[PDB]
């Protein structure tokens, strides 16, 4: 895939700073572009992380896999440790569209086996079963990148 | 708060 980590092998230190009120799942796209889940980050906490230049990180909710921003961007790439400072990765909540935010609330309160029983428009059942998917967002981010 | 105004 186009979205992948380069096998640079140049170590870079990164502060995974979880500035969102959610448990963050750091997702690393390997050299083939396949996403690999790393240990989760508790809300508010930050961690010193060993990574490499040109590696691709995206950050999800650990429970719902909701997309999260890092430095106001979908994807994070560690730069060289200029002046010896560790690169900061501020993982934050994006302003969700009101539809998507309500969809996350319904998804947590209602289990999948009950979406099609709610007294709502039938097309909302398809939107509810459209759970947040990392592989789906990798297709979208590839399309947005190659354009 | 914007999401919970007084």
């Amino acid at each position: 895939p186009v979205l992948r980590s380069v096998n640079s092998r140049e170590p870079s230190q990164v502060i995974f700073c979880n500035r969102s009120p959610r448990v963050v799942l750091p997702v690393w796209l390997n050299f083939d572009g396949e996403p690999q889940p790393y240990p989760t980050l508790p809300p508010g906490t930050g961690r010193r992380i060993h990574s490499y230049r040109g590696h691709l990180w995206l950050f999800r909710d650990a429970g719902t896999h909701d997309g999260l921003l890092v430095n106001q961007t979908e994807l994070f790439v560690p730069s060289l440790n200029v002046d010896g400072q560790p690169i900061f990765a501020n993982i934050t909540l994006p302003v969700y569209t009101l539809k998507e935010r309500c969809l996350q609330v319904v998804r947590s309160l209602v289990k999948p086996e009950n979406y099609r029983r709610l007294d709502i428009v039938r097309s909302l059942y398809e939107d509810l079963e459209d759970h947040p998917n990392v592989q789906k967002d990798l297709e979208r981010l590839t399309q947005e990148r190659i354009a | 708060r914007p999401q919970a105004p007084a």
């Binding site: 969102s20 009120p21 501020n90 009101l98 609330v105 309160l109 909302l124 | 999401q3 919970a4 105004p5």
Partner: protein, 78 residues
């Protein structure tokens, strides 16, 4: 400019009400959506304008379980 929404009556700025594609089509006064759901939409507009492109961290938009379905229906319409 300021615009008026009706369920109760709410008044918001046109730069805030423009967050809704449907209201931006109707405006180019609108009456609908129960007040307890349309006030939540007015709170989302303030939340969106405040925190879009904000340098600070952003707080989770709070939604009550009893309004989740009524507000999802309204949001899907807007």
């Amino acid at each position: 400019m300021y615009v008026k929404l009706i369920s109760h009556e709410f008044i918001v700025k046109r730069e805030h009400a423009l967050t809704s594609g449907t209201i931006k089509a109707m405006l180019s006064e609108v009456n609908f959506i129960p007040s307890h759901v349309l006030s939540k939409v007015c709170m989302y507009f303030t939340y969106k304008v405040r925190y879009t492109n904000s340098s600070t961290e952003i707080p989770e938009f709070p939604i009550a379980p009893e309004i989740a379905l009524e507000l999802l229906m309204a949001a899907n319409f807007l």
